[PDB]
Amino acid sequence: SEHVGKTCQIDVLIEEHDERTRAKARLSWAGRQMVGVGLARLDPADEPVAQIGDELAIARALSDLANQLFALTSSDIEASTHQP
């Protein structure tokens, strides 16, 4: 006591359309499926690569999910107090 931690996995999918690569980052949290969605871009042409589009999409997906988790934190904080 007190050493207990826990383990999640975030499942990332990257789909390249084109132009036009999209990432989805899915987290199961507090009994809800949370999905961050990110989109690139690039550019049209030429073209790049590939890794650039993927990593930018993932970055935007994770930001989205982070922002959703920040919104959940605030909501929960506000729920915990007030309690009148």
Coordinates of all heavy atoms in Angstrom, one line a residue:
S1 N 0.8 -1.2 0.0 CA 0.0 0.0 0.0 C 0.9 1.3 0.0 O 1.7 1.4 0.9 CB -1.0 0.0 1.2 OG -0.3 -0.3 2.4
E2 N 0.6 2.2 -1.0 CA -0.4 2.0 -2.0 C 0.3 2.1 -3.4 O 0.6 3.2 -3.8 CB -1.5 3.1 -1.8 CG -1.7 3.6 -0.4 CD -0.9 4.8 -0.1 OE1 -0.9 5.8 -0.8 OE2 -0.1 4.7 1.0
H3 N 0.4 1.0 -4.0 CA 1.2 0.8 -5.2 C 0.4 0.5 -6.5 O 1.0 0.3 -7.6 CB 2.2 -0.3 -5.0 CG 1.6 -1.6 -4.6 ND1 1.1 -2.5 -5.5 CD2 1.3 -2.0 -3.3 CE1 0.6 -3.5 -4.8 NE2 0.7 -3.3 -3.5
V4 N -0.9 0.4 -6.4 CA -1.8 -0.1 -7.5 C -2.0 0.9 -8.6 O -2.6 2.0 -8.5 CB -3.1 -0.7 -7.0 CG1 -4.0 -1.1 -8.1 CG2 -2.8 -1.9 -6.1
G5 N -1.5 0.5 -9.8 CA -1.7 1.2 -11.1 C -2.6 0.3 -12.0 O -3.0 -0.8 -11.7
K6 N -2.9 0.9 -13.2 CA -3.7 0.2 -14.2 C -3.2 0.4 -15.6 O -2.4 1.3 -15.9 CB -5.2 0.5 -14.0 CG -5.5 1.9 -13.7 CD -6.9 2.1 -13.3 CE -7.0 3.0 -12.1 NZ -8.3 2.8 -11.4
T7 N -3.8 -0.3 -16.6 CA -3.3 -0.4 -17.9 C -4.4 -0.3 -19.0 O -5.4 -1.0 -19.0 CB -2.5 -1.7 -18.1 OG1 -1.2 -1.6 -17.5 CG2 -2.3 -2.0 -19.6
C8 N -4.3 0.7 -19.8 CA -5.2 0.9 -21.0 C -4.5 0.6 -22.2 O -3.2 0.5 -22.3 CB -5.7 2.3 -21.1 SG -6.5 2.9 -19.6
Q9 N -5.2 0.4 -23.3 CA -4.7 0.5 -24.6 C -5.6 1.4 -25.4 O -6.8 1.4 -25.3 CB -4.6 -0.8 -25.3 CG -3.4 -1.6 -24.9 CD -3.1 -2.8 -25.8 OE1 -4.0 -3.6 -25.9 NE2 -1.9 -2.8 -26.4
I10 N -5.0 2.3 -26.2 CA -5.7 3.1 -27.2 C -5.4 2.5 -28.5 O -4.3 2.3 -28.9 CB -5.2 4.6 -27.1 CG1 -5.5 5.2 -25.8 CG2 -5.7 5.4 -28.2 CD1 -4.6 6.4 -25.4
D11 N -6.5 2.2 -29.2 CA -6.5 1.5 -30.5 C -6.5 2.5 -31.6 O -7.5 3.2 -31.8 CB -7.7 0.5 -30.6 CG -7.6 -0.6 -29.7 OD1 -6.5 -1.2 -29.5 OD2 -8.6 -1.0 -29.1
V12 N -5.4 2.7 -32.4 CA -5.3 3.7 -33.4 C -5.5 3.0 -34.8 O -4.8 2.1 -35.1 CB -4.0 4.5 -33.4 CG1 -4.0 5.6 -34.5 CG2 -3.7 5.0 -32.0
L13 N -6.4 3.6 -35.6 CA -6.5 3.2 -37.0 C -6.1 4.4 -37.9 O -6.6 5.5 -37.7 CB -8.0 2.8 -37.3 CG -8.5 2.6 -38.7 CD1 -7.9 1.4 -39.3 CD2 -10.0 2.6 -38.7
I14 N -5.3 4.2 -38.9 CA -4.9 5.2 -39.9 C -5.4 4.7 -41.3 O -4.9 3.7 -41.8 CB -3.4 5.4 -40.0 CG1 -2.8 5.7 -38.6 CG2 -3.1 6.6 -40.9 CD1 -2.1 4.5 -38.0
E15 N -6.3 5.5 -41.9 CA -6.8 5.2 -43.2 C -6.4 6.3 -44.2 O -6.6 7.5 -43.9 CB -8.3 5.1 -43.3 CG -9.0 4.2 -42.2 CD -10.5 4.2 -42.3 OE1 -11.1 3.5 -43.1 OE2 -11.1 5.0 -41.6
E16 N -5.8 5.9 -45.3 CA -5.3 6.9 -46.3 C -6.2 6.8 -47.5 O -6.2 5.8 -48.2 CB -3.8 6.6 -46.6 CG -2.9 6.7 -45.4 CD -1.8 5.7 -45.4 OE1 -1.0 5.7 -46.4 OE2 -1.7 5.0 -44.4
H17 N -6.9 7.9 -47.8 CA -8.0 7.9 -48.8 C -7.7 7.7 -50.3 O -8.1 6.6 -50.8 CB -9.0 9.0 -48.5 CG -9.8 8.8 -47.2 ND1 -11.2 8.9 -47.2 CD2 -9.4 8.6 -45.9 CE1 -11.6 8.8 -45.9 NE2 -10.5 8.6 -45.2
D18 N -7.0 8.6 -51.0 CA -6.5 9.9 -50.6 C -7.5 11.0 -50.7 O -8.7 10.8 -51.0 CB -5.3 10.2 -51.5 CG -3.9 9.8 -50.9 OD1 -3.8 9.6 -49.7 OD2 -3.0 9.6 -51.7
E19 N -7.2 12.3 -50.5 CA -5.8 12.9 -50.4 C -4.8 12.7 -49.3 O -3.6 12.6 -49.5 CB -5.8 14.4 -50.9 CG -6.0 15.4 -49.8 CD -7.4 16.1 -49.9 OE1 -8.1 16.0 -51.0 OE2 -7.9 16.6 -48.9
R20 N -5.2 12.5 -48.0 CA -6.5 12.7 -47.3 C -6.5 11.6 -46.2 O -7.4 10.8 -46.2 CB -7.7 12.6 -48.1 CG -8.8 13.7 -47.8 CD -8.6 14.4 -46.4 NE -9.1 15.8 -46.5 CZ -8.7 16.8 -45.7 NH1 -7.8 16.5 -44.7 NH2 -9.1 18.0 -45.9
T21 N -5.5 11.6 -45.4 CA -5.3 10.5 -44.4 C -6.0 10.9 -43.1 O -5.8 12.0 -42.6 CB -3.8 10.0 -44.3 OG1 -3.5 9.8 -42.9 CG2 -2.9 11.1 -44.8
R22 N -6.7 9.9 -42.5 CA -7.5 10.1 -41.3 C -7.1 9.1 -40.2 O -7.0 7.9 -40.5 CB -9.0 10.0 -41.6 CG -9.8 10.2 -40.3 CD -10.9 9.2 -40.2 NE -12.0 9.4 -41.1 CZ -12.9 8.5 -41.6 NH1 -12.7 7.2 -41.2 NH2 -13.8 8.8 -42.4
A23 N -6.9 9.5 -39.0 CA -6.7 8.7 -37.9 C -7.8 8.7 -36.8 O -8.4 9.8 -36.6 CB -5.3 8.9 -37.2
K24 N -8.1 7.6 -36.3 CA -9.1 7.5 -35.2 C -8.3 6.8 -34.0 O -7.7 5.8 -34.2 CB -10.3 6.6 -35.6 CG -11.2 7.4 -36.5 CD -12.3 6.5 -37.1 CE -13.3 7.3 -37.8 NZ -14.6 6.6 -37.9
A25 N -8.4 7.4 -32.9 CA -7.8 6.9 -31.6 C -8.9 6.6 -30.6 O -9.5 7.5 -30.1 CB -6.8 7.8 -31.0
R26 N -9.2 5.3 -30.4 CA -10.3 4.8 -29.5 C -9.8 4.4 -28.2 O -8.9 3.6 -28.0 CB -11.0 3.7 -30.2 CG -12.2 3.1 -29.4 CD -12.8 1.9 -30.0 NE -11.8 0.9 -30.5 CZ -12.1 -0.2 -31.1 NH1 -13.4 -0.6 -31.4 NH2 -11.1 -1.0 -31.6
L27 N -10.5 5.0 -27.1 CA -10.2 4.7 -25.8 C -11.5 4.3 -25.1 O -12.5 5.0 -25.2 CB -9.5 5.8 -25.0 CG -9.4 5.8 -23.5 CD1 -8.5 4.7 -23.0 CD2 -8.9 7.1 -23.0
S28 N -11.6 3.2 -24.4 CA -12.7 2.8 -23.5 C -12.4 3.4 -22.2 O -11.5 3.0 -21.5 CB -12.8 1.3 -23.4 OG -13.5 0.8 -24.6
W29 N -13.3 4.3 -21.7 CA -13.1 5.0 -20.5 C -14.4 5.4 -19.8 O -15.3 5.9 -20.4 CB -12.3 6.3 -20.7 CG -11.9 6.9 -19.4 CD1 -12.4 8.1 -18.9 CD2 -10.9 6.5 -18.5 NE1 -11.8 8.4 -17.7 CE2 -10.9 7.4 -17.4 CE3 -10.0 5.4 -18.5 CZ2 -10.0 7.3 -16.3 CZ3 -9.1 5.3 -17.4 CH2 -9.2 6.2 -16.3
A30 N -14.5 5.1 -18.5 CA -15.6 5.4 -17.6 C -16.9 4.9 -18.3 O -17.9 5.6 -18.3 CB -15.7 6.8 -17.3
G31 N -16.9 3.7 -18.9 CA -18.0 3.1 -19.5 C -18.5 3.7 -20.8 O -19.6 3.5 -21.2
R32 N -17.6 4.5 -21.4 CA -17.9 5.1 -22.7 C -16.7 4.8 -23.7 O -15.6 4.7 -23.4 CB -18.2 6.6 -22.6 CG -17.0 7.5 -22.3 CD -17.5 8.8 -21.8 NE -17.7 8.8 -20.3 CZ -18.2 9.8 -19.6 NH1 -18.5 10.9 -20.1 NH2 -18.4 9.6 -18.3
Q33 N -17.1 4.8 -25.0 CA -16.2 4.6 -26.1 C -15.8 6.0 -26.5 O -16.6 6.8 -27.0 CB -16.8 3.9 -27.3 CG -17.4 2.5 -27.0 CD -16.3 1.6 -26.4 OE1 -15.2 1.6 -26.9 NE2 -16.7 0.8 -25.4
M34 N -14.5 6.4 -26.3 CA -14.1 7.7 -26.7 C -13.2 7.6 -28.0 O -12.3 6.8 -28.0 CB -13.4 8.4 -25.6 CG -14.2 8.5 -24.3 SD -13.3 9.4 -22.9 CE -13.2 11.2 -23.5
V35 N -13.5 8.4 -28.9 CA -12.8 8.4 -30.2 C -12.3 9.8 -30.5 O -13.1 10.7 -30.7 CB -13.6 7.9 -31.4 CG1 -12.7 7.6 -32.6 CG2 -14.3 6.6 -31.0
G36 N -11.0 9.9 -30.7 CA -10.3 11.1 -31.2 C -10.2 11.0 -32.7 O -9.7 9.9 -33.1
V37 N -10.5 12.0 -33.5 CA -10.4 11.9 -34.9 C -9.5 13.0 -35.4 O -9.6 14.1 -35.0 CB -11.8 12.0 -35.6 CG1 -11.7 11.6 -37.0 CG2 -12.8 11.2 -34.9
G38 N -8.5 12.6 -36.3 CA -7.6 13.5 -36.9 C -7.4 13.3 -38.4 O -7.5 12.2 -38.9
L39 N -7.2 14.5 -39.1 CA -7.2 14.5 -40.5 C -6.0 15.3 -41.1 O -5.8 16.5 -40.6 CB -8.5 15.0 -41.1 CG -9.7 14.1 -41.1 CD1 -10.9 14.7 -40.6 CD2 -9.8 13.6 -42.6
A40 N -5.3 14.8 -42.0 CA -4.3 15.5 -42.8 C -4.7 15.1 -44.3 O -5.0 14.0 -44.4 CB -3.0 15.0 -42.5
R41 N -4.7 16.0 -45.3 CA -4.1 17.3 -45.5 C -3.2 17.1 -46.7 O -3.7 16.6 -47.8 CB -3.3 17.9 -44.3 CG -4.0 19.1 -43.6 CD -3.0 19.9 -42.7 NE -2.5 21.1 -43.4 CZ -1.3 21.2 -43.9 NH1 -0.4 20.2 -43.8 NH2 -0.9 22.4 -44.4
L42 N -1.9 17.4 -46.6 CA -0.8 17.0 -47.5 C -1.2 16.4 -48.9 O -1.6 15.3 -49.0 CB 0.1 16.0 -46.8 CG 1.1 16.3 -45.7 CD1 2.2 17.3 -46.1 CD2 0.3 16.8 -44.4
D43 N -1.0 17.2 -50.0 CA -0.6 18.6 -50.0 C -0.4 19.2 -51.4 O 0.3 20.2 -51.5 CB 0.6 18.9 -49.1 CG 1.9 18.3 -49.5 OD1 2.0 17.8 -50.7 OD2 2.9 18.4 -48.7
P44 N -0.9 18.7 -52.6 CA -1.6 17.4 -52.9 C -0.9 16.0 -52.7 O -1.5 15.3 -51.9 CB -2.2 17.7 -54.3 CG -2.1 19.1 -54.5 CD -0.9 19.6 -53.7
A45 N 0.2 15.6 -53.4 CA 1.1 16.3 -54.3 C 2.1 17.4 -53.8 O 1.8 18.6 -53.6 CB 0.4 16.8 -55.6
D46 N 3.4 17.0 -53.6 CA 3.9 15.8 -54.2 C 4.8 15.0 -53.1 O 6.0 15.3 -53.1 CB 4.7 16.1 -55.5 CG 5.1 14.8 -56.2 OD1 4.4 13.8 -56.1 OD2 6.2 14.9 -56.9
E47 N 4.3 14.2 -52.3 CA 2.9 13.9 -52.1 C 2.4 13.7 -50.7 O 1.2 13.7 -50.5 CB 2.4 12.8 -53.1 CG 2.5 11.3 -52.5 CD 3.5 10.5 -53.2 OE1 3.9 10.9 -54.4 OE2 4.0 9.5 -52.6
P48 N 3.3 13.5 -49.7 CA 4.7 13.2 -49.7 C 5.2 11.7 -50.1 O 5.6 11.6 -51.3 CB 5.2 13.7 -48.3 CG 4.0 14.5 -47.8 CD 2.8 13.8 -48.3
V49 N 5.1 10.6 -49.4 CA 5.2 10.3 -47.9 C 4.2 10.9 -46.9 O 4.3 12.0 -46.5 CB 6.7 10.4 -47.4 CG1 7.4 11.8 -47.5 CG2 6.9 9.9 -46.0
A50 N 3.2 10.1 -46.5 CA 3.1 8.7 -46.2 C 3.3 8.6 -44.7 O 2.3 8.6 -44.0 CB 4.2 7.9 -46.9
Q51 N 4.5 8.7 -44.2 CA 4.7 8.8 -42.7 C 4.3 10.1 -42.2 O 3.7 10.2 -41.1 CB 6.2 8.5 -42.4 CG 6.5 8.3 -40.9 CD 7.9 8.3 -40.6 OE1 8.7 7.5 -41.0 NE2 8.4 9.4 -39.9
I52 N 4.6 11.2 -43.0 CA 4.2 12.6 -42.6 C 2.7 12.7 -42.4 O 2.2 13.2 -41.4 CB 4.7 13.6 -43.6 CG1 6.2 13.6 -43.7 CG2 4.2 15.0 -43.2 CD1 6.8 14.4 -44.8
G53 N 1.9 12.2 -43.4 CA 0.4 12.3 -43.3 C -0.1 11.5 -42.1 O -1.0 11.9 -41.5
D54 N 0.5 10.3 -41.9 CA 0.0 9.4 -40.9 C 0.3 10.0 -39.5 O -0.6 10.0 -38.7 CB 0.8 8.0 -40.9 CG 0.4 7.2 -42.2 OD1 -0.5 7.6 -42.9 OD2 1.0 6.1 -42.3
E55 N 1.5 10.4 -39.2 CA 1.9 11.0 -37.9 C 1.2 12.3 -37.6 O 0.9 12.6 -36.5 CB 3.4 11.1 -37.8 CG 4.1 12.1 -38.7 CD 5.6 11.9 -38.9 OE1 6.1 10.9 -38.4 OE2 6.2 12.8 -39.5
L56 N 0.9 13.1 -38.6 CA 0.1 14.3 -38.4 C -1.4 14.0 -38.1 O -2.0 14.6 -37.3 CB 0.2 15.2 -39.7 CG -0.6 16.5 -39.6 CD1 -0.3 17.3 -38.4 CD2 -0.2 17.4 -40.9
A57 N -1.9 13.0 -38.8 CA -3.3 12.5 -38.5 C -3.3 12.0 -37.1 O -4.3 12.3 -36.3 CB -3.7 11.5 -39.5
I58 N -2.4 11.1 -36.7 CA -2.3 10.6 -35.3 C -2.2 11.7 -34.3 O -2.9 11.7 -33.3 CB -1.2 9.6 -35.1 CG1 -1.3 8.4 -36.1 CG2 -1.1 9.1 -33.7 CD1 -0.1 7.5 -36.1
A59 N -1.3 12.6 -34.5 CA -1.2 13.8 -33.6 C -2.5 14.5 -33.4 O -2.9 14.8 -32.3 CB -0.1 14.7 -34.1
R60 N -3.2 14.8 -34.5 CA -4.5 15.5 -34.4 C -5.6 14.6 -33.7 O -6.4 15.1 -33.0 CB -5.0 15.9 -35.8 CG -4.0 16.9 -36.4 CD -4.4 17.3 -37.8 NE -3.8 18.6 -38.1 CZ -3.4 19.0 -39.3 NH1 -3.7 18.3 -40.3 NH2 -2.8 20.2 -39.4
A61 N -5.6 13.3 -34.0 CA -6.5 12.4 -33.3 C -6.2 12.4 -31.8 O -7.2 12.4 -31.0 CB -6.3 11.0 -33.9
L62 N -5.0 12.3 -31.4 CA -4.6 12.3 -29.9 C -5.0 13.6 -29.2 O -5.4 13.5 -28.0 CB -3.2 11.9 -29.7 CG -2.7 10.5 -30.2 CD1 -1.2 10.3 -29.9 CD2 -3.5 9.4 -29.5
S63 N -4.8 14.7 -29.9 CA -5.2 16.0 -29.4 C -6.7 16.1 -29.1 O -7.1 16.6 -28.1 CB -4.9 17.1 -30.4 OG -3.5 17.1 -30.8
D64 N -7.4 15.5 -30.1 CA -8.9 15.5 -30.0 C -9.3 14.7 -28.8 O -10.1 15.2 -28.0 CB -9.4 14.8 -31.3 CG -11.0 14.9 -31.3 OD1 -11.5 15.7 -30.6 OD2 -11.6 14.1 -32.0
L65 N -8.7 13.5 -28.6 CA -9.0 12.7 -27.5 C -8.5 13.3 -26.2 O -9.3 13.2 -25.2 CB -8.4 11.3 -27.7 CG -8.6 10.2 -26.7 CD1 -10.1 9.8 -26.6 CD2 -7.8 9.0 -27.0
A66 N -7.4 13.9 -26.2 CA -6.9 14.6 -25.0 C -7.9 15.7 -24.6 O -8.2 15.8 -23.4 CB -5.5 15.2 -25.2
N67 N -8.4 16.5 -25.6 CA -9.3 17.6 -25.3 C -10.6 17.0 -24.8 O -11.3 17.7 -23.9 CB -9.6 18.4 -26.6 CG -8.4 19.2 -27.0 OD1 -7.5 19.6 -26.2 ND2 -8.3 19.4 -28.3
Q68 N -11.1 15.9 -25.3 CA -12.3 15.2 -24.7 C -12.0 14.8 -23.3 O -12.9 14.9 -22.5 CB -12.6 14.0 -25.6 CG -13.2 14.4 -26.9 CD -13.4 13.2 -27.8 OE1 -14.0 12.2 -27.4 NE2 -12.8 13.3 -29.0
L69 N -10.8 14.3 -23.0 CA -10.5 13.9 -21.6 C -10.4 15.1 -20.7 O -10.6 15.0 -19.5 CB -9.2 13.0 -21.6 CG -9.4 11.6 -22.1 CD1 -8.1 11.0 -22.5 CD2 -10.2 10.8 -21.1
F70 N -9.9 16.3 -21.2 CA -9.9 17.5 -20.4 C -11.3 18.0 -20.1 O -11.6 18.4 -19.0 CB -9.1 18.6 -21.1 CG -7.6 18.4 -21.1 CD1 -6.8 18.4 -22.3 CD2 -6.9 18.3 -19.9 CE1 -5.5 18.2 -22.2 CE2 -5.5 18.1 -19.8 CZ -4.8 18.1 -21.0
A71 N -12.2 17.9 -21.1 CA -13.6 18.2 -20.9 C -14.2 17.3 -19.9 O -15.1 17.7 -19.1 CB -14.3 18.2 -22.2
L72 N -13.8 16.1 -19.9 CA -14.4 15.1 -18.9 C -13.9 15.4 -17.5 O -14.7 15.2 -16.5 CB -14.1 13.7 -19.3 CG -14.7 12.5 -18.5 CD1 -16.2 12.7 -18.3 CD2 -14.4 11.2 -19.2
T73 N -12.6 15.7 -17.4 CA -12.0 16.1 -16.1 C -12.8 17.3 -15.5 O -13.1 17.2 -14.3 CB -10.5 16.4 -16.3 OG1 -9.9 15.3 -17.0 CG2 -9.9 16.6 -14.9
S74 N -13.0 18.3 -16.3 CA -13.7 19.5 -15.8 C -15.1 19.2 -15.3 O -15.5 19.6 -14.3 CB -13.7 20.6 -16.8 OG -14.5 21.7 -16.4
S75 N -15.8 18.5 -16.2 CA -17.2 18.1 -15.9 C -17.2 17.3 -14.6 O -18.1 17.5 -13.7 CB -17.7 17.2 -17.1 OG -18.9 16.7 -16.8
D76 N -16.3 16.3 -14.4 CA -16.3 15.5 -13.2 C -15.9 16.3 -12.0 O -16.5 16.2 -11.0 CB -15.3 14.3 -13.4 CG -15.9 13.2 -14.3 OD1 -17.1 13.2 -14.6 OD2 -15.0 12.4 -14.7
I77 N -14.8 17.2 -12.2 CA -14.5 18.1 -11.1 C -15.6 18.9 -10.7 O -15.9 19.1 -9.5 CB -13.3 19.1 -11.5 CG1 -12.0 18.3 -11.6 CG2 -13.1 20.2 -10.5 CD1 -10.8 19.1 -12.2
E78 N -16.4 19.5 -11.6 CA -17.6 20.3 -11.3 C -18.7 19.5 -10.6 O -19.3 20.0 -9.7 CB -18.1 21.1 -12.5 CG -17.0 22.0 -13.1 CD -16.4 22.9 -12.0 OE1 -17.1 23.5 -11.2 OE2 -15.1 22.9 -12.0
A79 N -18.8 18.3 -11.1 CA -19.8 17.3 -10.5 C -19.5 17.0 -9.0 O -20.3 16.9 -8.2 CB -20.0 16.1 -11.3
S80 N -18.2 16.7 -8.8 CA -17.7 16.3 -7.4 C -17.9 17.4 -6.4 O -18.4 17.1 -5.3 CB -16.3 15.8 -7.4 OG -15.3 16.9 -7.4
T81 N -17.6 18.6 -6.8 CA -17.9 19.9 -6.0 C -18.2 21.0 -7.1 O -17.3 21.3 -7.8 CB -16.8 20.4 -5.1 OG1 -15.5 20.2 -5.8 CG2 -16.7 19.6 -3.8
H82 N -19.4 21.5 -7.2 CA -20.5 21.5 -6.1 C -21.1 20.2 -5.7 O -21.1 19.2 -6.4 CB -21.7 22.4 -6.6 CG -22.5 21.8 -7.7 ND1 -23.8 21.4 -7.4 CD2 -22.3 21.4 -8.9 CE1 -24.4 20.8 -8.5 NE2 -23.4 20.8 -9.4
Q83 N -21.6 20.2 -4.4 CA -22.5 19.2 -3.9 C -23.3 19.9 -2.7 O -23.0 19.6 -1.6 CB -21.9 17.9 -3.5 CG -20.4 17.9 -3.2 CD -20.0 18.6 -1.9 OE1 -19.2 19.5 -1.8 NE2 -20.6 18.1 -0.8
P84 N -24.3 20.8 -3.1 CA -25.0 21.6 -2.1 C -26.3 20.9 -1.5 O -27.0 21.5 -0.6 CB -25.4 22.8 -2.9 CG -25.3 22.4 -4.3 CD -24.8 21.0 -4.4

